[PDB]
Design a protein around this ligand. Structure first.
Ligand SMILES: NC(=O)c1ccc[n+]([C@@H]2O[C@H](COP(=O)([O-])OP(=O)(O)OC[C@H]3O[C@@H](n4cnc5c(N)ncnc54)[C@H](O)[C@@H]3O)[C@@H](O)[C@H]2O)c1
Ligand SMILES: NC(=O)c1ccc[n+]([C@@H]2O[C@H](COP(=O)([O-])OP(=O)(O)OC[C@H]3O[C@@H](n4cnc5c(N)ncnc54)[C@H](O)[C@@H]3O)[C@@H](O)[C@H]2O)c1
Ligand SMILES: O=c1ccn([C@@H]2O[C@H](COP(=O)(O)OP(=O)(O)O[C@H]3O[C@H](CO)[C@@H](O)[C@H](O)[C@H]3O)[C@@H](O)[C@H]2O)c(=O)[nH]1
Ligand SMILES: O=c1ccn([C@@H]2O[C@H](COP(=O)(O)OP(=O)(O)O[C@H]3O[C@H](CO)[C@@H](O)[C@H](O)[C@H]3O)[C@@H](O)[C@H]2O)c(=O)[nH]1
Ligand code: NA
Ligand code: NA
Ligand code: NA
Ligand code: NA
Ligand code: NA
Ligand code: NA
Lengths: 338, 338
């Protein structure tokens, strides 16, 4: 199929693009490079074993979006593009709403204009809000996210829903991601955050590489087995694979298809730390700190539905997630080249 | 004060502009004329007894917004501009999200840019969602609106909230309107819907004027005193006055000030009909029809808070609302001139 991957050059997108090419689809990446570098492109093609076309641009530019859609005869769109720093989202709300809410709205408006009606959206478990009922299940009604980032994701899911309702021929998958980690097995592709990493894994990796002193464990008094926060980590390659499958099986299948993308199990902060210590061959330095604002104690996905409907489930383990990350971190301490 | 009134030429805006000028403020109207005509301008100035500056333009045009803000040294912004047809919103979701959500976002982004930090937003009781607890009170948590229109209003309230949180010097009033009706006492200004009116009052008026046959009463089996839907109708002049007061008392008073704007009492469809029959001197034709999709049985506002904090409450009655509407309808059967 002919797919446009917005945010194609970022973390999740790049991995997805490799898997898509491996499956022989024709890929067009659209990215504005605010959070990624052109250096990843050649890696994508190498690992993907096929050439992906790249277009530097912004989802907010409807006219360009429209043109791309048409120019490449796109069949489906996978939308990874947007801003995701939760804390920053609190400090800079307008930029989040603009890039996420208006950003998607301009893209789907361009789609309408070029008659493209297959969409895949990067959503998040955050949309469940403060749900005491775990694991989280697609049948649960949504809640209210605490940050501009999470609210922006729920607002988009709502706008897509309403759109499909008005244009019933559209197929729209709302993929609710859990906690993506890991990197391509080659160790030549991976997450390359700039500045202080906000997520656990990369932070741990940076401590291990010798860049950082100690990992600050945000809270040790939660109501969990070890008292640290519990989450559903999902290898980025499993996530990528899920995106190919969803795109191939749902194309032209009208409705809004919601699926949680997670391993279906929780791991605590310590469990992750221990996994990394083992991967890197040395104890990862850490200390206990106060709870992080807005953090929920524990949550993981109920991923039965994707198993059932798309015959998709993860296959990588936590150790693998840790090992693959250390391999990428260690092989490319400076990340992607300028 | 120097105020920019977006949507200034529409129903609520025009009335508000008159009251604002009467209070000697300097008004700048910004409207794109999608739902209003330039013919109202001279009426505004006449009734307002002062000249308002008019600028034809779209809230979606951030650069223009910015320029206006600066060019006129605006102190505060009253934002009435947007789309409001509930049913159409279901059929045309993207246009609603674009004009309402992106529309406001572009405006507040321009404000930020020109250093304007006083805002008044036209919100709605719809944001309360399906709340069994009536009357509705500003302390109630919001719910989930059933239409793209209502969702767009709640999404804006959320984005403004987050914005104030990030820029604590901002004063933002979220004015939740009930059911605006009526017209200026002169009978020379009023609501001028194009096509089939979606709201009760104007529809009734059109039946009375001889344009329409019968009023279709959407449902007679509700759990109300007479079985017809119950709402909080509020004269447009009371609403306008509330907007002046809120603007004068809250300017430079940091926070998010939420107030319900309603009479604080409910009236059924029949009560409104009977009021109009009396105003127009003839029985208004009507018939019972099936319930309208998405309609709630009964709801009204708890407006104690605005009483208490801004010393504001309505002063017009239901009869007045009906009489003023009939006077405008009858004096100008064709509405505003092309
Ligand atoms: N990584 C996570 O933990 C997490 C969890 C939930 C949801 N998501 C969502 O998944 C998607 C991918 O996240 P990721 O980890 O790969 O992030 P990422 O930052 O690596 O990828 C986002 C990409 O989008 C590009 N981009 C940003 N704004 C754009 C715009 N306006 N126009 C065009 N390109 C733009 C960035 O430059 C970057 O290449 C995002 O929407 C993110 O919100 C990720
Ligand atoms: N009338 C009601 O029953 C109702 C109830 C709740 C909320 N509101 C809100 O109150 C505000 C005023 O409503 P109203 O009854 O006066 O409606 P209206 O249609 O008379 O006024 C809206 C005005 O905005 C202008 N406009 C529309 N989109 C614009 C855009 N993108 N750029 C610039 N101008 C634009 C229209 O041309 C019109 O003059 C609206 O936001 C409406 O959603 C009204
Ligand atoms: O320096 C750190 C970073 C994280 N943690 C803890 O580790 C867990 C995971 O934190 P983090 O990696 O930030 O992930 P989440 O807060 O769960 O959020 C991720 O996953 C969400 C979906 O579950 C998405 O909405 C977000 O965008 C994404 O950042 C939580 O218990 C954190 O408290 C620490 O103790 N120290
Ligand atoms: O032809 C008609 C029109 C209305 N009604 C009834 O009269 C009442 C009022 O209907 P309407 O004037 O459409 O107002 P609402 O549905 O209550 O909505 C108005 O007030 C809301 C806030 O309460 C705003 O969100 C909306 O934008 C605005 O249109 C309801 O019980 C309707 O069922 C009829 O029976 N026949
Ligand atoms: Na429809
Ligand atoms: Na960064
Ligand atoms: Na680097
Ligand atoms: Na802040
Ligand atoms: Na109309
Ligand atoms: Na007319």
């Amino acid at each position: 199929m002919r797919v446009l991957v917005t945010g194609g050059s970022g973390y999740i997108g790049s991995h997805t693009c490799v898997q898509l090419l491996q499956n022989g689809h024709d890929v067009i990446i659209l990215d504005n490079l605010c959070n990624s570098k052109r250096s990843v492109l050649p890696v994508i093609e190498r690992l993907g074993g096929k050439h992906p076309t790249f277009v530097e641009g912004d989802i907010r530019n409807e006219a360009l979006m429209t043109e791309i859609l048409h120019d490449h005869a796109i069949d489906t769109v996978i939308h990874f593009a947007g801003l995701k720093a939760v804390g920053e989202s609190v400090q800079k709300p307008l930029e989040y709403y603009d890039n996420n809410v208006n950003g998607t709205l301009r893209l789907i408006s361009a789609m309408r204009a070029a008659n493209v009606k297959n969409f895949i959206f990067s959503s998040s478990a955050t949309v469940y809000g403060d749900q005491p009922k775990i694991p989280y299940v697609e049948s649960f009604p949504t809640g209210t996210p605490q940050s501009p980032f999470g609210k922006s994701k729920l607002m988009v899911e709502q706008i897509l829903t309403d759109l499909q309702k008005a244009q019933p021929d559209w197929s729209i998958a709302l993929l609710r991601y859990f906690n993506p980690v890991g990197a391509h097995p080659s160790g030549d592709m991976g997450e390359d955050p700039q500045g202080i990493p906000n997520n656990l894994m990369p932070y741990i990796a940076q401590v291990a590489v010798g860049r950082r002193d100690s990992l600050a464990i945000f809270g040790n008094d939660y109501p969990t087995e070890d008292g640290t926060g519990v989450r559903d980590y999902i290898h980025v390659m499993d996530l990528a694979d899920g995106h190919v499958v969803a795109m191939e099986k749902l194309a032209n299948k009208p409705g809004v298809h919601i699926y949680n993308l997670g391993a279906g199990v929780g791991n605590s902060v310590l469990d992750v730390v221990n996994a990394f210590s083992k991967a890197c061959g040395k104890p990862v330095n850490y200390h206990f700190a106060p709870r992080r604002e807005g953090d929920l104690p524990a949550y993981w996905a109920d991923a039965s539905k994707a198993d059932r409907e798309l015959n998709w489930r993860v296959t990588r383990t936590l150790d693998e997630m840790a090992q693959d990350t250390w391999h990428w971190q260690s092989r490319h301490p400076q990340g992607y080249p300028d």
